[PDB]
C-alpha cells in the first residue's frame, strides 16, 4: 500500500493543496467542516478545543495541529522507518480518545473532499492507498 511512486505524487499534490501561511488555516478549517458535514457525530469529539466556534483561535489551532501532523507524515512517506515510528506515536495518542473505524473513514473522505478542490490535478487512487497507509497506522 502506497508505493515509492505514489508517495512522490501524494507528497507533490499535498504540498500544493495544503499551501502556506493562512491558506493552511483556511484549508484546515475546511477539512474539519467537511468531516462534520460527513459524520455529524464526530463534532462532539472536539468539544475540548472550541468546536462551538470553528473560526475561534482555539479550534483553528487544533485543525492546524492535525493537518500539520498529516503534513509531517506525508513528508516522511518515503522514509518508511521514520513514519512507522511517528504513526505508532500518534496511535498511542489516539488510543484513549474513543474513536472507531468510521471516524477515520469519514476523515479520509473529508481529505478526499477538500484536497482536490485546491488542485488542478488529483489522483484519488494514489491518495486512497496512501491515506489508508497513514490512517491504518494511527487507528491502531
Amino acid at each position: 500500500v502506497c508505493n515509492r511512486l505514489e508517495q512522490i505524487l501524494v507528497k507533490t499534490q499535498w504540498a500544493q493543496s495544503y499551501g502556506e501561511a493562512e491558506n493552511r488555516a483556511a484549508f484546515s478549517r475546511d477539512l474539519f467542516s467537511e468531516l462534520f458535514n460527513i459524520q455529524g457525530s464526530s463534532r462532539a469529539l472536539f468539544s475540548g478545543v472550541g468546536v462551538d466556534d470553528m473560526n475561534s483561535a482555539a479550534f483553528t489551532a487544533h485543525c492546524l495541529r492535525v493537518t500539520g501532523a498529516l503534513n509531517r507524515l506525508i513528508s516522511q512517506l518515503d522514509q518508511q522507518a521514520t513514519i512507522n515510528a511517528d504513526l505508532a506515536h500518534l496511535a498511542g495518542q489516539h488510543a484513549s480518545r474513543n474513536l472507531d473505524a468510521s471516524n477515520f473513514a469519514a476523515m479520509g473522505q473529508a481529505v478526499m473532499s477538500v484536497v482536490p478542490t485546491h488542485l488542478d490535478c488529483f489522483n484519488q487512487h494514489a491518495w486512497g492507498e496512501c491515506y489508508e497507509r497513514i490512517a491504518s497506522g494511527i487507528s491502531g
Binding site: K11, T12, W14, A15, Q16, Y18, E20, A21, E22, R24, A25, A57, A58, T60, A61, L64, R65, G68, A69, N71, R72, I74, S75, Q76, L77, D78, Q79, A81, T82, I83, N84, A85, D86, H89
Partner: protein, 145 residues
C-alpha cells in the same frame, strides 16, 4: 511590533522554501538533525532526554525530530495570525510544562538553532526577521519555564 506582518511573511516564505512536504523525508531529517546538533551544543541538554537518544540512525529519534520541527513549522506558518499562533504556542507551552527538564533557555536555544540552520541552507535568509519571529515563538513556548 516584534515579528511584524512583514517579518512573518518573509520568514514563512523562506521556511517553506527550505521545508515542505514535497521534499524527500531524508532531506527534512537532515535539516532537523542539523538543527538538533546545533541545539545540543548550544544548550547542553542531554540527548537521552529524547526518544532515540539523539542517534540520527534511530528511527525513533528521527520521528521525534520530525514532531518537533513540525510543531515549529505549524507555528511559523501561523505567524500572520497572532491569535491563532498564540493559541498554538500556549498548547505547546502546556505540553512542555509537563516535561521535566524543559527550560526557557533551552527553548530559546532550539528556536535559535532553527534560524541558524535555515541561514546555512538559505544564506539569503532575513536573519533579523528570523530572530524576531523565533523569539516570539520561543517566548510563547517557554512561558514560565
Amino acid at each position: 511590533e516584534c515579528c511584524s506582518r512583514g517579518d512573518a511573511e518573509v520568514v514563512i516564505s523562506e521556511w517553506d522554501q527550505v521545508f515542505n512536504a514535497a521534499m524527500a523525508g531524508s532531506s527534512e531529517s537532515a535539516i532537523g538533525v542539523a538543527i538538533f546538533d546545533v541545539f545540543f551544543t548550544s544548550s547542553g541538554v542531554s540527548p537521552s532526554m529524547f526518544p532515540g537518544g539523539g542517534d540520527s540512525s534511530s528511527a525513533e529519534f528521527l520521528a521525534q525530530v520530525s514532531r518537533v520541527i513540525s510543531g515549529a513549522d505549524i507555528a511559523i506558518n501561523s505567524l500572520t495570525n497572532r491569535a491563532t499562533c498564540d493559541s498554538l504556542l500556549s498548547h505547546l507551552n502546556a505540553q512542555h510544562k509537563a516535561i521535566s527538564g524543559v527550560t526557557g533557555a533551552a527553548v530559546t536555544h532550539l528556536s535559535e538553532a532553527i534560524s541558524s540552520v535555515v541561514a546555512q541552507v538559505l544564506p539569503s535568509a532575513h536573519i533579523d526577521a528570523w530572530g524576531y519571529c523565533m523569539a516570539y515563538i520561543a517566548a510563547g513556548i517557554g512561558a514560565g519555564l
